[PDB]
Curated annotation (Swiss-Prot), chains A, B:
Note: Unlike the carbohydrate-specific transporters of the PTS, the complex DhaKML has no transport activity.
MF GO annotations: glycerone kinase activity; identical protein binding; phosphoenolpyruvate-glycerone phosphotransferase activity; protein homodimerization activity
Official protein name in the record: PEP-dependent dihydroxyacetone kinase, dihydroxyacetone-binding subunit DhaK
DhaK domain segment(s): 1-332
Entry binding sites for dihydroxyacetone: G44, S45, G46, H47, K95, D100
Taxonomic classification: Bacteria, Pseudomonadati, Pseudomonadota, Gammaproteobacteria, Enterobacterales
List of catalytic residues: H47, H198
GO cellular component: cytosol; transferase complex
Gene: dhaK
Known partners and oligomeric status: Homodimer. The dihydroxyacetone kinase complex is composed of a homodimer of DhaM, a homodimer of DhaK and the subunit DhaL. DhaL also forms a complex with DhaR.
């Protein structure tokens, strides 16, 4: 099995990780870490390094890969959470896809029934399309990475589960993403505008004219599609039931300070992502947005798709402190 | 100009770097760093992050990007070296291509003629083809990255120019690489075996049967093509002339300890690189090679070429200590 070989390779390459079998999942080699909230995510393979490249101090305690573009089954999630439970609760980060919501919400109840204090955070940052192919609402994409890092730093400093959960839901309402593909993972000199990380259709197919023009269109869409009201369910561990919560996003606006993530969906040359970033900085400056930090690289992929996404996440001094905090994972590493 | 936009983007993304104009080059924002040997490289754009993503503490002092797959002109190299010169010499790392050798060699003379103590290290790690299209001898490829980190650590701790040059030449004789492409940046289900980072032809075109079979063939080639004797010129700064030095490589063999670099040439999914790493570890274990450290990712690319390369560098305890030493660059970051 190729997927088997890929995970064995990840494990051999990174001794800070432990690959488990029966069922398969990955955790920090030092888990469970006593006394800190444990953070977990997962989803289909094909988005590497998300989420296994994010396992480590200051970020995920563990992750649950599934088959290509397919949610891990509930047994994997339950066993991974039990393995990382440090006595302070486990927070489940779930991207907004039908399969992921179903399997993670099922694991959540099984965990609850076994005495584990758990709660959830749903990510729906893709502003492009409401109700795509495998999603009720907006699709969960690259902002998931920014949220894992920020909530990961908060868990590592010792915040409670409730605190980690409220911060993740707040960030979710402040982060906005859009992606484009020039080639799947079907017409010359055309792009799928507002594409999904599983290959879901975007807003439309439109001509690619230049890098700068594509960025302008993506940026403009982030500015005008920001307003959003919807229900996101979360697990209330005190009542032991799902709570429907209306959640509100404000559009990005002049005066917002942001973290920018320019993300390779798969086969975009890094030189091009720097050109994207150059145009993005100009547009934010013109619109009154201050980019305070950035990440530019392959952080949330779709196999070998040719395209990239732009993510802008509103932040304040407290959030920036969580950004600057140490993280030690395969994909992201920085010290004090 | 797209290159202009791409370089402005790199500069805006990384305040630890300074982009210069008239002529264009990039340096550490803190250069010149007094009292340390300065390390420089450069080459055609299209291999990002090599070399600009390696500028920072513990690695390059600066780099000189040229146009796509084209060497920087000697004025760029000269001015960059003058900007980073810390009074203890400048070491130029040059990959073995006709154009790079000629421009860096011309800059070396201009530098010497201006009072700057300088010397060179030529990289010729690609074991696949002798005398390809743009090269007398063997092509310089991904081992260039490992050498910049190791020699970068030696320079950062204060080693002398001669000590840094000797280390670089020694490592060059101990590092071996081979690349394959499944698509240019051709044929169906066929690969260009032993391909060059500028699209040069390899040993041959052959059928792609599987990932594991491809890795086996690449690895076998690294074992059987390792022996090599050739002349590499270097700048003798005391005599003020080029010195022809016969240099020797021994094949890799049972008992060697290595650092492995599994490198995406452009469009290979990270999941697949881990599968590559998994097969590589098995083959190294069978052959008697101990992989002590690895790097898996996009470190020396060829635009959006679909393919990957494998590099194995023989090391000892001293070299492993230089690998583990602190490095803080756009592409490589660790403190232990």
């Amino acid at each position: 099995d190729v997927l088997d070989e890929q995970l064995a390779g990840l494990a051999k390459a990174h001794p800070s990780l432990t690959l488990h079998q029966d069922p398969v999942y990955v955790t920090r080699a030092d888990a469970p870490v006593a006394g800190k909230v444990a953070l977990l995510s997962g989803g289909g393979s094909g988005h590497e390094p998300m989420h296994c490249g994010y396992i480590g101090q200051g970020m995920l305690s563990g992750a649950c890969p599934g088959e290509i573009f397919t949610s891990p089954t509930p047994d994997k999630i339950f066993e991974c959470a039990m393995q990382v439970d440090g006595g302070e609760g486990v927070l489940l980060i779930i991207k907004n896809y039908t399969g992921d919501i179903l399997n993670f919400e099922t694991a959540t109840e099984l965990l609850h029934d076994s005495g584990v204090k758990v709660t959830t955070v749903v990510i729906d940052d893709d502003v492009a399309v409401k109700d795509s192919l495998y999603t009720a609402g907006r699709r969960g994409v690259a902002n998931t990475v920014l949220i894992e890092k920020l909530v990961g730093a908060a868990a590592e400093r010792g915040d409670s589960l409730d605190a980690c959960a409220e911060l993740g839901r707040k960030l979710n309402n402040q982060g906005h993403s859009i992606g484009i593909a020039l080639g799947a993972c079907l017409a010359d000199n055309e792009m799928e505008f507002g594409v999904g990380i599983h290959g879901e259709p975007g807003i439309d197919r439109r001509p690619f004219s230049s890098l700068d023009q594509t960025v302008d269109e993506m940026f403009d869409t982030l500015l005008v599609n920001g307003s959003y009201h919807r229900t996101l369910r979360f697990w209330d561990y005190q009542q032991g039931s799902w709570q429907e919560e209306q959640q509100t996003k404000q559009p990005l606006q002049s005066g917002d300070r942001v973290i920018a993530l320019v993300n390779n969906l798969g086969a975009t040359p890094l030189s091009e992502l720097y050109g994207v970033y150059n145009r993005l900085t100009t547009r934010c400056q013109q619109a009154g947005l201050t980019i305070e930090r950035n990440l530019i690289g392959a952080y949330c992929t779709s196999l070998d798709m040719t395209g990239f996404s732009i993510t802008l996440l509103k932040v304040d001094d407290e959030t920036l402190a969580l950004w600057d905090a140490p993280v030690h994972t395969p994909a992201l590493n920085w010290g004090k």
